């Protein structure tokens, strides 16, 4: 008891030291510095395509590196690879388990990953000599549902799970190379840095952490939000990121400053955020909401700039092309629209 | 010129074949009804699943899938078992099932309030409105013997039971003692009060008393799903 009390007291002292350092590091705010910048309040765009064919609600999607082909996942048990320009279907992969929750597109273009409520990550081959798409590897070892996955290259992939940990795999041998064991609640999202040397993750406990891929331990923690974090995305230059939470706000964090420095909220907005994404330059911030809309924020002024209406149900996923030419959004109404 | 030829070939072959396969898949998909099984460790939901699997699983990774068929209509039930305590995130993958099966153990009063709270939390979720619930009270035999023995009294956990009076619509079984019926209907009325307090016309709850020897549960689920689908059709076809 006495030792436990001493440990708790010294933890409180370290917390106070960190808070004092954070307070000292703050001498201004984004609002004051950016007050002179002109706004972009003339943002308005309309849907240019509508992809049909999925039987049930869409849970995830991911662009290809060429920004022409994209893969989508639906809870009826299908992975469909569309051609964006002509709206043609290229492939259609049936899945063993229909409760898929995530999907990824290999940067090389040869594979697609999949996973969900089965605690497995399946790798599919799109360029087999026989001219068919077949399973080539299954990754097992997580004790909770799979929430996200991302390819590093043809051989390794990093995943997050509902068991509060993240892992790094080697596809050829299907073995866990590293494990990350910092969070306290479910991990809901991932995001890789442009150089693939770090990544961030947000959990059900209202905090986010930064990881070192090779070293294997956490380096920072951010505790600004009030409820579960549902989405996370790195900034183009790789020195900041943004999160979406169930408390109906978004916030932008600062790796170097270790501090939160912006909030995006409105009085009449009461629902939560489901997805976020940055534009090519980082001046815009797109977020999907539990209400069937999608709001375009001003990442520097923090005032709204537009809206994307037209879905008849909850907006679930969101993505932007590598060349910043189009935005794709899926929804629980089972349609996948392309805007602008 | 070769680009036009390639585009024509890709369009024709790929899109036509894929669309035909998708239509074939949709035909099968629309002809099956899927159900979610919920319960606690001391309940007997797995027992019922096994019973109708015998009466009428592969790829089990914590999820026990079961199939059965009544009057040539196909059903598919799922039982998530590979997850830990917290439920509030993976529960919304089931926002478009026909019904949710909720099983309770009514012979143990010390765990009754936990089931009451879980039912109340499910009934009021943002994404689980519009989904009906089938309610099974699973251990009527144990409850009957427990009440007959008289070792423990219900009023300690629920003091309101002292002033309870049996409802008129109650239809006791031929050989039932009045006080066992009183207790069981009281426990049922608790759940029904939570259900009717703040529900709506887009929501319903069907209760049934069940045991570990019953073999009518498949037909109960069938009839309740028929009622649910008819009520949805009334609204779809602009009669409501």
């Amino acid at each position, epitope marked *: 008891g006495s030792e436990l009390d001493q440990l708790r007291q010294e933890a409180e002292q370290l917390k106070n030291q960190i808070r004092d350092a954070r307070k000292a590091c703050a001498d201004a705010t984004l609002s004051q510095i950016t007050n002179n910048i002109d706004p972009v309040g003339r943002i308005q765009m309309r849907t240019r395509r509508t992809l049909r064919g999925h039987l049930a609600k869409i849970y995830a999607m991911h662009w290809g590196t060429d920004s022409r082909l994209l893969v989508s996942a639906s809870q009826d048990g299908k992975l469909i690879i569309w051609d964006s320009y002509t709206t043609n279907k290229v492939h259609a992969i049936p899945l063993r388990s229909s409760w898929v929750m995530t999907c990824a597109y290999a940067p090389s273009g040869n594979y697609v990953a999949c996973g969900g409520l089965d605690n497995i990550c399946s790798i599919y081959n799109l360029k087999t000599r026989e001219g068919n798409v077949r399973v080539s590897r299954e990754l097992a070892g997580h004790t909770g549902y799979l929430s996200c996955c991302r390819f590093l290259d043809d051989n390794q992939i990093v995943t997050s799970s509902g068991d509060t940990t993240c892992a790094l795999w080697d596809i050829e041998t299907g073995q866990q190379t590293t494990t990350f064991t910092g969070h*306290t609640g479910d991990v809901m999202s991932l995001s890789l840095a442009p150089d693939t040397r770090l990544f961030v993750s947000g959990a059900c406990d209202a905090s986010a952490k930064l990881w070192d891929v090779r070293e294997g331990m956490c380096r920072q923690t951010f*505790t600004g939000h009030e*409820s579960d974090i549902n989405a996370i995305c790195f900034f183009p230059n790789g020195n900041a990121f943004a999160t979406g939470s169930d*408390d109906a706000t978004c916030r932008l964090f600062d790796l170097r400053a270790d501090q939160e420095l912006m909030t995006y909220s409105h009085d009449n907005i009461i629902c939560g955020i489901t997805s976020v994404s940055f534009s090519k330059s980082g001046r815009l911030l797109l977020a999907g909401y539990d209400d069937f809309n999608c709001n375009v924020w001003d990442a520097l002024k923090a005032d709204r700039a537009g809206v994307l209406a037209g879905h008849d149900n909850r907006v679930s996923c969101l993505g932007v092309t590598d060349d910043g030419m189009a935005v794709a959004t899926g929804s629980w109404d089972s349609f996948l629209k392309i805007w602008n | 010129t070769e680009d036009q030829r390639n585009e024509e070939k890709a369009q024709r072959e790929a899109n036509k074949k894929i669309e035909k396969q998708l239509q074939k898949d949709k035909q099968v998909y629309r002809a099956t009804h899927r159900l979610l099984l919920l319960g606690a460790d001391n309940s007997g939901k797995s027992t019922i699943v096994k019973q109708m699997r015998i009466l009428h699983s592969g790829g089990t990774s914590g999820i026990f899938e079961t199939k059965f068929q009544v009057d040539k209509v196909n059903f598919h039930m799922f039982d998530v078992g590979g997850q830990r305590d917290e439920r509030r995130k993976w*529960i919304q993958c089931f926002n478009d099932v026909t019904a949710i099966i909720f099983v309770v153990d009514s012979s143990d009063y010390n765990r009754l309030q936990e089931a009451l709270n879980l039912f109340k939390s499910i009934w*009021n979720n943002r994404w689980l409105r519009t989904i009906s619930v089938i309610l099974f009270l699973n251990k009527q035999d144990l409850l009957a013997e427990k009440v007959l023995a008289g070792k423990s009294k219900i009023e300690d956990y629920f003091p309101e039971f002292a002033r309870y009076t049996t409802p008129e619509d109650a239809t006791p079984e031929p050989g039932e003692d009045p006080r066992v019926t009183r207790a069981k209907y009281f426990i049922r009325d608790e759940f029904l009060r939570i259900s009717t307090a703040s529900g709506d016309g887009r929501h319903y709850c069907y209760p049934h008393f069940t045991c570990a020897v019953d073999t009518e549960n498949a037909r109960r689920i069938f009839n309740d799903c028929r009622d649910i689908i008819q009520r949805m059709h009334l609204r779809q076809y602009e009669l409501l």
Partner: nanobody
Amino acid sequence: QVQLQESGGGLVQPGGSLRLSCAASGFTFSNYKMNWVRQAPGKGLEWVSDISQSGASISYTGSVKGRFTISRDNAKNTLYLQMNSLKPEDTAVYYCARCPAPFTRDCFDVTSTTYAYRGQGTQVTVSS
């Protein structure tokens, strides 16, 4: 940084009285609803009482009905539990809990193990 700190408690004779206080910081107190949860020796977490945002819609577990009372103070971000007529079966740690989402009337995982938005607890012992 969500944190909740409990106070009060100690040794009390059967039929005694105590007042538990729970100070909250780091969130809007009035948007969420609050609960009381206790863990007796050799037992799991157990739900006791809850109170809605405004102050109406109170609820209790039956074993403590007519004995304990719950209330809010939205101006001070504090929660209370006036205990009286204590019995030996009330010896346990008492945690201060709150729901995961603000504008909701469902509270899913408040009684789980390793739930994040819960307090450290305070020991209440009743004996002679």
